């Protein structure tokens, strides 16, 4: 029921690595500060997304056993998880508590980002669903690690090698759900359920970005490698 000494060690190691990310307040303060044009918001996104991929590669490299995996499978895992990890981090940021009225302004600022309305509706639906689960910092960290170490990614040669690495993280998360939310025994299942909804952002990600109301869709060389753009 309770975490074993090895599980407490793994949890703290994942947490320390996860906290190397850009602070949510840094992101929300920028968006809440001024009302930006669609052109300025596109550049804010590319810079934010480039920082996120850089930090995500560093977090991924620290996941126990990742460096022992096949080099081609390592690339496949990173490319397969980058977009999902970005939406999971955006959901964490969106659900962080702000002074009264600020989360309403943040929502409105995201609606006026420059992208098509058809892509906005599913994002908020996912963020509000993530928010109702009242996830702790440890739950977001483990869920990101679980997303990265998904053995069911396309172009994976050794699925069992990936499964062996994801298994101890799923075990720790299951114990945390039972401890943090004993009132809701469906909590772990709900978290695994959100992981299946996260995957919907993959297929139409390039279409969403190219729908931005800008003259030139300039992406960084790193974003071109991880996204299906340029």
């Amino acid at each position: 029921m309770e975490l074993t000494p090895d599980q407490q060690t793994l949890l703290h190691f994942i947490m320390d690595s996860y906290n190397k990310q850009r602070m949510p307040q840094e992101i929300t303060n920028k968006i809440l500060k001024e009302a930006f044009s669609a052109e300025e918001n596109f550049l804010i996104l590319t810079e934010m997304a480039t920082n996120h991929v850089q930090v995500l590669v560093e977090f991924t490299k620290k996941l126990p056993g990742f460096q022992t995996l096949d080099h081609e499978d390592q690339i496949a895992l990173l490319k397969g998880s980058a977009v999902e990890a970005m939406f999971l981090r955006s959901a964490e940021i969106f659900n962080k508590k702000l002074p009264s009225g600020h989360s309403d302004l943040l929502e409105a600022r995201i609606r006026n980002s420059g992208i098509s309305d058809e892509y906005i509706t599913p994002m908020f639906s996912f963020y509000k669903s993530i928010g109702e689960l009242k996830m702790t910092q440890e739950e977001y960290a483990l869920l990101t690690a679980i997303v990265i170490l998904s053995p069911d990614r396309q172009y994976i040669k050794d699925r069992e090698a990936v499964e062996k690495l994801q298994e101890p993280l799923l075990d720790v998360l299951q114990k945390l759900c039972k401890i943090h939310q004993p009132e809701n025994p469906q909590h772990f299942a709900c978290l695994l359920g959100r992981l299946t909804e996260l995957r919907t952002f993959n297929h139409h990600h390039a279409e969403m970005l190219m729908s931005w109301r800008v003259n030139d869709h300039k992406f960084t060389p790193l974003l071109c490698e991880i996204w299906d753009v340029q």
Binding site: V57, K61, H71, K79, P221, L222, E225
Partner: peptide, 11 residues
């Protein structure tokens, strides 16, 4: 193809 990702991983 994924030269930058391979570089960041192998660094």
């Amino acid at each position: 193809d994924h030269q930058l990702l391979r570089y960041l991983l192998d660094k």
